[PDB]
Coordinates of C-alpha atoms and ligand atoms in Angstrom, one line a residue:
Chain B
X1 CA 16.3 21.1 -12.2
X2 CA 13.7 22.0 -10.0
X3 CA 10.8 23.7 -11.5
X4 CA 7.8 25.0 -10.1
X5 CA 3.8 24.5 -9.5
X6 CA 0.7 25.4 -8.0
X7 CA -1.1 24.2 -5.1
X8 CA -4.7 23.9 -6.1
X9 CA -7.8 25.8 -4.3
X10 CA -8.9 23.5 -1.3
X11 CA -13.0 21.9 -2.0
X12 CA -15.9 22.6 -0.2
X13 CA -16.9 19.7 2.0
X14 CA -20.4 18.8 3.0
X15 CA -20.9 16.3 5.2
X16 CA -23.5 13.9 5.5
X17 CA -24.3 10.2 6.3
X18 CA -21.9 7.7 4.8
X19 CA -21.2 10.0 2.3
X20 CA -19.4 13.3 1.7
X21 CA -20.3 16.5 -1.2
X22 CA -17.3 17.9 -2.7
X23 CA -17.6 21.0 -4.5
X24 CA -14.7 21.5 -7.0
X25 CA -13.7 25.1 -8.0
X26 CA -11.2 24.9 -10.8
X27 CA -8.8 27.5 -12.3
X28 CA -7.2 24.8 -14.9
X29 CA -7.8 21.9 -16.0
X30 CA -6.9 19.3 -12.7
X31 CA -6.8 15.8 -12.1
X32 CA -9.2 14.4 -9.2
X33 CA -9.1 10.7 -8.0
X34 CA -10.2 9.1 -4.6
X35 CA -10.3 5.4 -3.5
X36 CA -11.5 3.5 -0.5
X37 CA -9.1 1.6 2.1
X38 CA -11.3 -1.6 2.5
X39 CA -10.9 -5.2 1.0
X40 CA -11.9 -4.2 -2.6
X41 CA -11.4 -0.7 -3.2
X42 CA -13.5 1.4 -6.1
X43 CA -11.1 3.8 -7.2
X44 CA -12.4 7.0 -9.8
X45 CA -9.8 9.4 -11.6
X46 CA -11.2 12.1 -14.1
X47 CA -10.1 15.6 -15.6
X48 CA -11.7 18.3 -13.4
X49 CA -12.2 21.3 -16.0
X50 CA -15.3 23.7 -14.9
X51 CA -17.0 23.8 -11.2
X52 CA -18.8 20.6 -10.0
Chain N
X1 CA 10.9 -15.1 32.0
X2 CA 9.4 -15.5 28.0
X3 CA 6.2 -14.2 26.9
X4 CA 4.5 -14.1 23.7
X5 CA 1.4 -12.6 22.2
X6 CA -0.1 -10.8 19.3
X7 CA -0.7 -7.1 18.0
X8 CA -3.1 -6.0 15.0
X9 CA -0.8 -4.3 11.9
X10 CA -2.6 -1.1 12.2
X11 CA 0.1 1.6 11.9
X12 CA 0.0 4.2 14.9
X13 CA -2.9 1.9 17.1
X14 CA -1.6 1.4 20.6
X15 CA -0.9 -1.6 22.1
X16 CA -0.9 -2.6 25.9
X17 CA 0.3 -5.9 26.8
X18 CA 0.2 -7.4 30.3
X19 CA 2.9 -9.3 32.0
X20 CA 1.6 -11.2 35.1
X21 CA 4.6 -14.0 36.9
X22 CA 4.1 -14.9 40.7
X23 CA 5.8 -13.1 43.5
X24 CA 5.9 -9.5 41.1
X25 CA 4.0 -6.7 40.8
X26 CA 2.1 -6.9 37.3
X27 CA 4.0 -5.2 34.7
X28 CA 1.9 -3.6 31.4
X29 CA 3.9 -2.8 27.9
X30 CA 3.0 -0.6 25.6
X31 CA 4.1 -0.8 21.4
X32 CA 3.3 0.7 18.4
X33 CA 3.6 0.5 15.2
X34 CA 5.1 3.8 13.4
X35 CA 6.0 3.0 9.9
X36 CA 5.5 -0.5 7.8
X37 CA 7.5 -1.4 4.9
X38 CA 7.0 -4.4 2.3
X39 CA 9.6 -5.2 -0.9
X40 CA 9.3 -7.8 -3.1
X41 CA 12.4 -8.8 -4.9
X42 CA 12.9 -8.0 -8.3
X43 CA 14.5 -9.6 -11.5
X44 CA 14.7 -7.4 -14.8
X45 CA 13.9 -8.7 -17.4
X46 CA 14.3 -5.9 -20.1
X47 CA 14.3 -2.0 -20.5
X48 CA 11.9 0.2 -23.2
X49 CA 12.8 3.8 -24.6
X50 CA 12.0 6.1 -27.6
X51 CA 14.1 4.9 -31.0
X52 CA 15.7 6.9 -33.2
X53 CA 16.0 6.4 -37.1
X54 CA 19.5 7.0 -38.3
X55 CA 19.5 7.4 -42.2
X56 CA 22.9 7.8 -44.0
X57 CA 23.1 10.4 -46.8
X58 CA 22.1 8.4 -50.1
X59 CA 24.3 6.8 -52.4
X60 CA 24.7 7.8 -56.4
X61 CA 26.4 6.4 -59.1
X62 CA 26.6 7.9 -62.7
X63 CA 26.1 5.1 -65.3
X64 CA 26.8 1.8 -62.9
X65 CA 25.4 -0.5 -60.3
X66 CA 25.8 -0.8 -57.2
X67 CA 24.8 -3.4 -54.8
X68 CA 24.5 -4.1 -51.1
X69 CA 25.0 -6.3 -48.6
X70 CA 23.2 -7.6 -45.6
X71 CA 24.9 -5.9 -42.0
X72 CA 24.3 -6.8 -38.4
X73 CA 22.5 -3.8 -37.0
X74 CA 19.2 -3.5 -35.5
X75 CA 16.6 -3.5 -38.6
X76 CA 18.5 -2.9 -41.4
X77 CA 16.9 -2.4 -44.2
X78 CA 18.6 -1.5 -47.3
X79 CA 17.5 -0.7 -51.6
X80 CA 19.0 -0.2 -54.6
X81 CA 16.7 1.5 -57.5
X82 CA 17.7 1.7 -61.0
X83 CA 16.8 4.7 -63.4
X84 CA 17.0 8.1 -61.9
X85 CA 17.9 11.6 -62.9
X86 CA 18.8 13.6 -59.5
X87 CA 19.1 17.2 -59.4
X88 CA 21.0 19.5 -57.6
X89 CA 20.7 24.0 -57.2
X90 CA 23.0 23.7 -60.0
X91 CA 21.9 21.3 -62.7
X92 CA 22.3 17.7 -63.5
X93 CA 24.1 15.7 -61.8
X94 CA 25.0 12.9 -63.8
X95 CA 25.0 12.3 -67.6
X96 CA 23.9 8.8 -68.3
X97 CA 20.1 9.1 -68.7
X98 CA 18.2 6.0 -67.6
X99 CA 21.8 4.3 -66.3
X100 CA 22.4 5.6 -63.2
X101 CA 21.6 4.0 -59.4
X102 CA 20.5 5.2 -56.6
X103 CA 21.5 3.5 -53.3
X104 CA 19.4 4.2 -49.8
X105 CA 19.6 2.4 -46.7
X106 CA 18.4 2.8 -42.7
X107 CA 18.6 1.4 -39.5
X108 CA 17.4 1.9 -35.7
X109 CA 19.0 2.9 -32.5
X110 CA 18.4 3.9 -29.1
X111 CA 17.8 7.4 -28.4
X112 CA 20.1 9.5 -26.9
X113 CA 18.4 10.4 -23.6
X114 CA 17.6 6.0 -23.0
X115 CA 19.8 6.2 -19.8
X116 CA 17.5 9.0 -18.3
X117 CA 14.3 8.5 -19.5
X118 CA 13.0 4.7 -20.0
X119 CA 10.6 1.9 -18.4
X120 CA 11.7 -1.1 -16.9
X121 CA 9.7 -4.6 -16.9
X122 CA 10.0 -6.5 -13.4
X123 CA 9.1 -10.1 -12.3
X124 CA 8.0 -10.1 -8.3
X125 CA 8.6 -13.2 -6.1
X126 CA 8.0 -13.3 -2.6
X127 CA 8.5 -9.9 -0.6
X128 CA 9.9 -9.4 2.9
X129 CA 9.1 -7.0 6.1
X130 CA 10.6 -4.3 7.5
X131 CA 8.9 -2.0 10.5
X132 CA 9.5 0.6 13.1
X133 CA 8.2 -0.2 16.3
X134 CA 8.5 1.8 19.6
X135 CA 8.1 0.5 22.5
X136 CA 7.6 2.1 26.3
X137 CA 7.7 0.5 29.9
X138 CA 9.3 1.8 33.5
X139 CA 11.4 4.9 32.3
X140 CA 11.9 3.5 28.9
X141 CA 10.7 4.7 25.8
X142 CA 12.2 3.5 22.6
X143 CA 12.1 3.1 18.8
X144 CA 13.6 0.4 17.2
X145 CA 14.0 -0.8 13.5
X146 CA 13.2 -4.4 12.8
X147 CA 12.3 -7.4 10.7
X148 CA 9.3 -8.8 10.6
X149 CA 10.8 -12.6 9.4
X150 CA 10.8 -14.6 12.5
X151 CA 14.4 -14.1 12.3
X152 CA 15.8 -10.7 13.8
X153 CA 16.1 -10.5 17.5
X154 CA 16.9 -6.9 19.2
X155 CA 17.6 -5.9 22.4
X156 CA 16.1 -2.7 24.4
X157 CA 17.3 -1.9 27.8
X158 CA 18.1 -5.7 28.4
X159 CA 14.8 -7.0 26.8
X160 CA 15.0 -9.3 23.9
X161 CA 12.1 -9.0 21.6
X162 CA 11.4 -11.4 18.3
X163 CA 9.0 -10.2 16.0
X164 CA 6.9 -11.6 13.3
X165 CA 6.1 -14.0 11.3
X166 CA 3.2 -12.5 9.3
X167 CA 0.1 -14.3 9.3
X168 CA -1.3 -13.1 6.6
X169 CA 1.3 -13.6 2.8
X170 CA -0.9 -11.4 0.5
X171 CA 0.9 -8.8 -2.0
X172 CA -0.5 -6.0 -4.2
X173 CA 2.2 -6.8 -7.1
X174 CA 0.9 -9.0 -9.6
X175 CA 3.6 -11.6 -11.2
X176 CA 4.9 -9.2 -13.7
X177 CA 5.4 -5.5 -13.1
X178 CA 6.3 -2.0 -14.9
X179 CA 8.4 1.1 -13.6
X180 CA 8.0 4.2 -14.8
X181 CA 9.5 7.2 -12.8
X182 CA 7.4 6.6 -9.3
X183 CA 4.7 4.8 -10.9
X184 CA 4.2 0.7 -10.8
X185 CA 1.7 -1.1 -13.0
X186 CA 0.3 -4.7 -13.0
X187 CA 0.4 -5.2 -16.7
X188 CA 2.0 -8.2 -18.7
X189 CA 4.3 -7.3 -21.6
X190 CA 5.6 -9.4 -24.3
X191 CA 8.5 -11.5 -23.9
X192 CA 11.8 -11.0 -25.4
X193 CA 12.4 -11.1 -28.9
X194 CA 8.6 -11.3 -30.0
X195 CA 7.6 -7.8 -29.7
X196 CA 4.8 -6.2 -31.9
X197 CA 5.2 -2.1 -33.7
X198 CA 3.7 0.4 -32.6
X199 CA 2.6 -1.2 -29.0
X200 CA 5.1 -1.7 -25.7
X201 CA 7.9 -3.0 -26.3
X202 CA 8.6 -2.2 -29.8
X203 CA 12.4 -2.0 -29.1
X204 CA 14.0 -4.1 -25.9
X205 CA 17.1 -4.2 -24.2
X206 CA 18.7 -6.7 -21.4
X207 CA 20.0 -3.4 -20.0
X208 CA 20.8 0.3 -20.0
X209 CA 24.5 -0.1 -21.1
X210 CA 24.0 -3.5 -23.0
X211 CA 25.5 -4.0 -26.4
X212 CA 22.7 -5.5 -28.3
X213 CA 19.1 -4.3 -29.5
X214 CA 16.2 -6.0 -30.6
X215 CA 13.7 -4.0 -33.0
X216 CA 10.8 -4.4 -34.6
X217 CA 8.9 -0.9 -36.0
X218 CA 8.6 -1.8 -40.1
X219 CA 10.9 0.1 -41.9
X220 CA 9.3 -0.2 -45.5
X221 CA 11.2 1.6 -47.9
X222 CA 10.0 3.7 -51.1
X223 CA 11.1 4.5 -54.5
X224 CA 12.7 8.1 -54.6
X225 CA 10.4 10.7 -56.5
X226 CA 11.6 12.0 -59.9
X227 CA 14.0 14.5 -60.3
X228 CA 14.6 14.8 -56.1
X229 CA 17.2 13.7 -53.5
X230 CA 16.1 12.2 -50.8
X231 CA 15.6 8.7 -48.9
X232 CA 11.4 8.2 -48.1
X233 CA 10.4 6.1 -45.6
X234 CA 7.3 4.5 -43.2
X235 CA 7.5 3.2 -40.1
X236 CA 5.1 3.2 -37.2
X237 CA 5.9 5.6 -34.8
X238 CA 7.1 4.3 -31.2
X239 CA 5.2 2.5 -28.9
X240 CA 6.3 4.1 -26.0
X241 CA 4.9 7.7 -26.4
X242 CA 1.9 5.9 -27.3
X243 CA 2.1 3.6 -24.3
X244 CA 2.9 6.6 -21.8
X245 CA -0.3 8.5 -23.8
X246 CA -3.3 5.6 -22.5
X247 CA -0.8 3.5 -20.0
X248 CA -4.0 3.3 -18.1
X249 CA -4.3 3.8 -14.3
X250 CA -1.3 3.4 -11.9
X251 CA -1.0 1.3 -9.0
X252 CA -0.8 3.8 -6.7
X253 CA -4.0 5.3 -7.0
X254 CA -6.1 1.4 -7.1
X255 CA -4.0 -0.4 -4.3
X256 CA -6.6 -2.3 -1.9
X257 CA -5.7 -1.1 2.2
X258 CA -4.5 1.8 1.5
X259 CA -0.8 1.0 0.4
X260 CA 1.3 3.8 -0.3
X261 CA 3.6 3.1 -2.9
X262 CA 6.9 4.2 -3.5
X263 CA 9.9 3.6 -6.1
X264 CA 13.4 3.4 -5.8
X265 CA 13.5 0.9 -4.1
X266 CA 9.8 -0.6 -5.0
X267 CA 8.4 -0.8 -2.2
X268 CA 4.4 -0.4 -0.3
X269 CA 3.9 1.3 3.2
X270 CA 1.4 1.7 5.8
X271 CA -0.9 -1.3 4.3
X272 CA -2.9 -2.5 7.1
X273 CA -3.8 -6.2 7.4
X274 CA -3.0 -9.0 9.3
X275 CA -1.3 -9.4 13.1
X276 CA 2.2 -9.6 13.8
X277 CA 3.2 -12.2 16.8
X278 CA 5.9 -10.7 19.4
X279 CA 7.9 -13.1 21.6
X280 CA 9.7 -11.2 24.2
X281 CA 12.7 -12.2 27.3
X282 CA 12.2 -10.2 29.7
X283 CA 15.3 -9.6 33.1
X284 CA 14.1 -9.7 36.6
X285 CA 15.5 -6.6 37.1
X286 CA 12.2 -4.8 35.3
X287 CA 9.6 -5.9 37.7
X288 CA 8.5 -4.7 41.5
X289 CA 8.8 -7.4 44.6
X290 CA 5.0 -7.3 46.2
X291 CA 6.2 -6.5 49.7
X292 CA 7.4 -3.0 48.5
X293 CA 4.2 -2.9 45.6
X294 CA 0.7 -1.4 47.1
X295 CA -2.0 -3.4 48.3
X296 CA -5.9 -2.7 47.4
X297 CA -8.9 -4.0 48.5
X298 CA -12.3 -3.5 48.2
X299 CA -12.0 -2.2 44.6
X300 CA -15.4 -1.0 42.9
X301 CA -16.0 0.4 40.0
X302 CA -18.0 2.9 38.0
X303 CA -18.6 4.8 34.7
X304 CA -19.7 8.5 35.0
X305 CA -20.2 9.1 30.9
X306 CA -19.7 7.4 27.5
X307 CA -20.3 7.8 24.0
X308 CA -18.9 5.3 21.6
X309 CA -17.2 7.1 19.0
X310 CA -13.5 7.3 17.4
X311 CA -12.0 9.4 19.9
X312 CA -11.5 8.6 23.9
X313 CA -15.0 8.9 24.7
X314 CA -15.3 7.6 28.0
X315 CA -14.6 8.3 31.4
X316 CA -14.4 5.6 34.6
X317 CA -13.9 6.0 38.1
X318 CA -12.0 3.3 40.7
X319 CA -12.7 3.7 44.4
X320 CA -10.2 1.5 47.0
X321 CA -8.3 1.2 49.8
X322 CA -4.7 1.1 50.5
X323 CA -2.2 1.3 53.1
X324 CA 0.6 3.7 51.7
X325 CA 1.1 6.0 48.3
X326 CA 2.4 4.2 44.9
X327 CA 2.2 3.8 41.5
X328 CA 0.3 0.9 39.8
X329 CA -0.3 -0.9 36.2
X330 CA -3.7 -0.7 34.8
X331 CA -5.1 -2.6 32.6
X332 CA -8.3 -3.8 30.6
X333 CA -8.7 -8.1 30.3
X334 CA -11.0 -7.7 27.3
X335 CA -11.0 -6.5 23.4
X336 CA -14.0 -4.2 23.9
X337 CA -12.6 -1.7 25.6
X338 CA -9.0 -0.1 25.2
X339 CA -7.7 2.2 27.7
X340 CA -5.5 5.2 27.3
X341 CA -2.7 5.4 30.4
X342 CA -1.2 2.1 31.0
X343 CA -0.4 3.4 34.7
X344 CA -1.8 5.5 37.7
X345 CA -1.0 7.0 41.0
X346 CA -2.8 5.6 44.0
X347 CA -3.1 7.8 47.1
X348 CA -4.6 7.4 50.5
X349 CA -7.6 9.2 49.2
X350 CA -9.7 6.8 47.1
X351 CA -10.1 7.8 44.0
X352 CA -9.0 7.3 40.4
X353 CA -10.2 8.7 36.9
X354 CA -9.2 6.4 34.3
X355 CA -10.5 7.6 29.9
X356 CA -11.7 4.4 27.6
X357 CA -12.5 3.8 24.4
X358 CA -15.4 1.3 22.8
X359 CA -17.7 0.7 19.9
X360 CA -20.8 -1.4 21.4
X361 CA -24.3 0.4 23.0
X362 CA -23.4 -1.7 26.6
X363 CA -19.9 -2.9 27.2
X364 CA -18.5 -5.1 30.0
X365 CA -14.9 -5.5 30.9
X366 CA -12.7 -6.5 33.6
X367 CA -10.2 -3.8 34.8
X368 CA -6.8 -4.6 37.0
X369 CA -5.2 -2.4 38.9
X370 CA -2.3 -3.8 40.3
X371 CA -3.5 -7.0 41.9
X372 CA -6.7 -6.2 42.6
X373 CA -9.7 -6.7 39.2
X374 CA -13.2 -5.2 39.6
X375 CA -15.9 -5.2 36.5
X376 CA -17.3 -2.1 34.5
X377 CA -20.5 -2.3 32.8
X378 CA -22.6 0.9 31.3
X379 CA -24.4 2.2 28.6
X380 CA -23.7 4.1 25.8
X381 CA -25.4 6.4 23.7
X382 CA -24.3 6.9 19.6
X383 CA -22.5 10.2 18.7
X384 CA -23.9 13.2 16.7
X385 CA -20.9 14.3 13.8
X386 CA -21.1 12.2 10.8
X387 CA -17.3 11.8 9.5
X388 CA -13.9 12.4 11.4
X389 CA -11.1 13.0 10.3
X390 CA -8.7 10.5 12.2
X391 CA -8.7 6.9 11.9
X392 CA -10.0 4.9 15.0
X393 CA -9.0 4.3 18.3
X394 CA -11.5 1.2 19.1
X395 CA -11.3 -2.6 18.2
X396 CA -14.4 -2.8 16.3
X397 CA -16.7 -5.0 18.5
X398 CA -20.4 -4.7 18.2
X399 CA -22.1 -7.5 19.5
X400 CA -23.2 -6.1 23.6
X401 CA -22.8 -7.6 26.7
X402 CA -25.6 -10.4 27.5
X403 CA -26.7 -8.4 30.6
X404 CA -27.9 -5.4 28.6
X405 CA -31.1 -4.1 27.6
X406 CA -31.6 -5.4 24.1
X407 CA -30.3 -9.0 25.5
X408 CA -32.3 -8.4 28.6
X409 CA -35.9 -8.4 26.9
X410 CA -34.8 -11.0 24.4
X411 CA -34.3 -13.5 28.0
X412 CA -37.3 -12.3 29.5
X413 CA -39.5 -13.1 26.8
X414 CA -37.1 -16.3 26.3
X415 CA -37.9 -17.3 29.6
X416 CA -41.4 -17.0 29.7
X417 CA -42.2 -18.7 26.5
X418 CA -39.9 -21.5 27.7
X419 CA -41.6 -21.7 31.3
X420 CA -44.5 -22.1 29.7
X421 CA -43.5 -24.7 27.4
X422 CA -42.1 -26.4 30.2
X423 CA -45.7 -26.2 32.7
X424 CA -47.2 -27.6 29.0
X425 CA -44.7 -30.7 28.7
X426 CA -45.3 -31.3 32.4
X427 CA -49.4 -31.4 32.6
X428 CA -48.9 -33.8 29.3
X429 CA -46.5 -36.1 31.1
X430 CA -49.1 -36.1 33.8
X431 CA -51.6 -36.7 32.1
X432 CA -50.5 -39.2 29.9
X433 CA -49.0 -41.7 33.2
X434 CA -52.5 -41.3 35.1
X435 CA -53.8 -42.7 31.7
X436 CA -51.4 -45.3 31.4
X437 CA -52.0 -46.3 35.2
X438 CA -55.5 -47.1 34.5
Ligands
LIG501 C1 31.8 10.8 -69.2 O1 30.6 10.8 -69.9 C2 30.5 9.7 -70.8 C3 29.2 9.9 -71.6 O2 28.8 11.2 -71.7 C4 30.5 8.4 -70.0 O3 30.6 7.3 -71.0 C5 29.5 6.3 -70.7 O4 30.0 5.3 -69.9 C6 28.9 4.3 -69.6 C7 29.5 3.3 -68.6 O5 30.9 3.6 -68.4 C8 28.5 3.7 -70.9 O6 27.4 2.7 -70.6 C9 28.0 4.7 -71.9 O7 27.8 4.1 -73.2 C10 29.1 5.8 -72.1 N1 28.7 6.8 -73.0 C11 29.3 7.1 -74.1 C12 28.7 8.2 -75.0 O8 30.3 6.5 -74.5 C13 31.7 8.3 -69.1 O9 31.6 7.2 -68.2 C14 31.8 9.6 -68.3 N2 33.0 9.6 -67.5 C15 33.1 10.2 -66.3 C16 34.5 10.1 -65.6 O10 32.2 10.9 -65.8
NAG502 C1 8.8 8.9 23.8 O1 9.8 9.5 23.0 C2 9.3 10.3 21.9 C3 10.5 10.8 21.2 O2 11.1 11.8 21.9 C4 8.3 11.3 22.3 O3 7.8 12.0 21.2 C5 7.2 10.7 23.2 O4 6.3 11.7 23.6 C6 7.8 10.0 24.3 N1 6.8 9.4 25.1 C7 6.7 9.6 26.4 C8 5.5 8.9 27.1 O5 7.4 10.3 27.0

């Protein structure tokens, strides 16, 4: 069946150079993960629980 | 008339190709790339799902013995103990003492929901292409689906196009593979018939509806406590819940180039790398005679603002001369800069805006229109906003054009260190044949 979920709160982006600030305002526990689209990538996955 | 050339595998970068034969107007193509696919091919090799312990109701007998014999199920592991006294919510059950027997056996199976809910092992070999291309010239403007093997050959408004081979045979699938749902991981699993408890690939089958079932969980038996009924037994629980506990991370959040994957059929999109050669027959029917195609002379050219960044940031003006109204193919000879319309409208006035792309501080490039070629050069000055959120429009090329200002002082100062060099070697030659004169 289909069963249902909800769409987390969007980050706060800062900008800046070569790099970007993400502040994370969880309501449950969420799963985060980013990678890169070059030669070797360096992915990172964690368990988001409180605001970061 | 045959033509062949090469485009970067960069999914939704454009690509302008120019066709140039004598006695025709020049002709420019434009493809793109919408969607990529790449499948390797698969050979299963066994299935893994939860097991279930079946245990019979056990066996009594009232002053005898009973013994049992081996069977050809998965596992089984049978007992026989000797001197035991069950009870029951009524009473005794048995008079003899110390002379009764107590027979308890088990086995393994496949669990019920094994045809829903279960991971499969794959071997990959090599992996084919498959690609969406569309392609626009004159008044067409099409999309066609394709293989990238050398091999296909498809036809669009009386144009035959070959595509491919890729020059580049790299894969993100390791040599063995496992399926989970819509998750793929590059782990190696034990081969059949030698698996260990308690890890992956406790139980294994050669299929979903196959017949036969290998197991290995140790199921110990143990002695029945006084005065009870039941059958005890240890056995270490299944590997797969623990294996879908700390599986690890999935393929499809570590793939290098940004490869989407998908399951069902395995499969990775949208990974970038490599070119992809394009042969092409073209019909004379496509092209423009140059008696009826405009003539311009005089063509010069100039750049009114740039700033090399991601987007279109560039504008160019062409000033000319012609002798009647018409529409011509434009086009840039170089890798440096990549233009936006592949064609333009040439009046009786003179003028033409044209928008270009490019990554170095001074570019130079040679722009056709029509027949006619003129060269741009300009400076650039770097952009303000840090990250964008579109990929970019520019070959990268960083290395400027030898007639700008960095370049320029470096030849200056080239120059005059090697004039003077030079004025040094001569007065020493001099010198040295009135000396040897003497
Ligand atoms: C009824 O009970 C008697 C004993 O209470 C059982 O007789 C025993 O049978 C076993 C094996 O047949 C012998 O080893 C014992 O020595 C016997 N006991 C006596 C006192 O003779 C008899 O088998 C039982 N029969 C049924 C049908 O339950
Ligand atoms: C080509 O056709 C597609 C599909 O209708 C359309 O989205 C696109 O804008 C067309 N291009 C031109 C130049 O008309």
């Amino acid at each position: 069946i289909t069963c249902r979920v909800p769409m987390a709160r969007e980050p706060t982006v800062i900008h800046g150079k070569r790099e970007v600030t993400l502040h994370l305002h969880p309501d449950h526990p969420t799963l985060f993960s980013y990678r890169t689209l070059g030669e070797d990538p360096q992915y990172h996955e964690e368990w988001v629980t409180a605001a970061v | 008339y045959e033509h062949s050339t090469v485009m970067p595998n960069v999914v939704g970068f454009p690509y302008k190709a120019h066709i140039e034969r004598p006695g025709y107007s020049p002709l420019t193509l434009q493809m793109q790339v919408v969607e990529t696919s790449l499948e390797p091919t698969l050979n299963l090799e066994y299935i893994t799902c939860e097991y279930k312990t079946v245990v019979p109701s056990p066996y009594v007998k009232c002053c005898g013995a009973s013994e049992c014999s081996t069977k050809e199920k998965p596992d089984y592991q049978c007992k026989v103990y000797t001197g035991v006294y069950p009870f029951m919510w009524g009473g005794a059950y048995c008079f003899c003492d110390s002379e009764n027997t107590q027979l308890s056996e088990a086995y393994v199976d496949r669990s019920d929901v094994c045809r829903h809910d279960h991971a499969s092992a794959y071997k990959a070999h090599t992996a084919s292409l498959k690609a969406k291309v569309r392609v626009m010239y004159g008044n067409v403007n099409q999309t066609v689906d394709v293989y990238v093997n050398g091999d296909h050959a498809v036809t669009i408004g009386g144009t035959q196009f070959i595509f491919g081979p890729l020059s580049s045979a790299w894969t993100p699938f390791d040599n063995k593979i496992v399926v989970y749902k819509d998750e793929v991981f590059n782990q190696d699993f034990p081969p059949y018939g030698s698996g260990q408890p308690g890890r992956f690939g406790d139980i294994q089958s050669r299929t979903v509806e196959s017949n036969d079932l290998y197991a290995n969980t140790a199921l110990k038996l143990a002695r029945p406590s006084p005065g009870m009924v039941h059958v005890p037994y240890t056995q270490t629980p299944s590997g797969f819940k623990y294996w879908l506990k700390e599986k690890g991370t999935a393929l499809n959040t570590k793939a290098p180039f940004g490869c989407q994957i998908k399951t069902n059929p395995v499969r990775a999109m949208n990974c970038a790398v490599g070119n992809i050669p394009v042969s092409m027959n073209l019909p004379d029917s496509a092209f423009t005679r140059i008696v009826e195609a405009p003539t311009i002379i005089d063509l010069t050219c100039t750049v009114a603002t740039c700033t090399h960044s991601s987007d279109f940031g560039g504008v160019l003006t062409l000033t000319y001369k012609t002798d009647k109204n018409g529409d011509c193919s434009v086009h840039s000879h170089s890798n440096v800069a990549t233009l936006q319309e592949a064609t333009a409208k040439v009046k009786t006035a003179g003028k033409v805006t044209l928008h270009f792309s490019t990554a170095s501080a001074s570019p130079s490039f040679v722009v056709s229109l029509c027949s006619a070629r003129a060269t741009c050069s300009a400076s650039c000055e770097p952009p303000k906003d840090h990250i964008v959120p579109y990929a970019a429009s520019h070959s990268n090329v960083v290395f400027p054009d030898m007639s700008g200002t960095a370049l320029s002082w470096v030849q200056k100062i080239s120059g005059g260190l090697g004039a003077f060099a030079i004025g040094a070697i001569l007065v020493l030659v001099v010198v040295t044949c009135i000396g040897l004169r003497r």
